[PDB]
Design a binder for this molecule. Sequence first.
Ligand code: CL
Ligand code: CL
Ligand code: CL
Ligand code: CL
Lengths: 124, 124
Amino acid sequence: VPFDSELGLQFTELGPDGARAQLDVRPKLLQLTGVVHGGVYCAMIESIASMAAFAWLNSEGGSVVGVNNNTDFVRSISSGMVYGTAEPLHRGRRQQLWLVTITDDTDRVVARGQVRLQNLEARP
Amino acid sequence: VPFDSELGLQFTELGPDGARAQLDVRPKLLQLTGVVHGGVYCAMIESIASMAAFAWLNSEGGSVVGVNNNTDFVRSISSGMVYGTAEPLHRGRRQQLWLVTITDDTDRVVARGQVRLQNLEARP
Ligand SMILES: [Cl-]
Ligand SMILES: [Cl-]
Ligand SMILES: [Cl-]
Ligand SMILES: [Cl-]
């Protein structure tokens, strides 16, 4: 996934019930006060949820497209690894809703978000 | 802003009533299927809103911290420039709420989001 490469996002788990991925906080990922740019977490949340959603749909099949990403920012950090896990809230014919929670290396939540996706049909 | 440099985000307007910025969609900003990673728009929305919010607060003053970013994805594109504008929804003592709308080079909306920020006090 191109943008994931820029983030340094690396997946550790991926399947129909969820996904997990991680990245190292680096200086290029910060904002002006030297803490993580919120966009990084929004992006992490989007990636992890979308990959889980695709895995589930294809476990008739098809593709997925994001329609809403709603992220709450909890705690400001400046370095170390962050870790996200996606868990399912709704998985149906038309849409899916996934929760992604990002923690730091002290198991404190730094961000948490929900991603709503549309399922798109495949050619039969 | 370090992460804005990674995005290629360049501001054109910044003041108390809003901000505007723009980036070129490049291959590094794409996801699996060759369209813009939703995270990019999330991040754009976060940056433009936060800078508008900081400008308004300092027009006692202080700093700002994001607490929620809620972005709707509207249209998938693969190239060209995108342009965001922040408009104010609420600006008060404790919090701000900003709307950011992202358009492409045909003036179609590609993403739209609202960012909720906390105002943080300064040393008097
Ligand atoms: Cl994996
Ligand atoms: Cl639908
Ligand atoms: Cl400017
Ligand atoms: Cl508050």
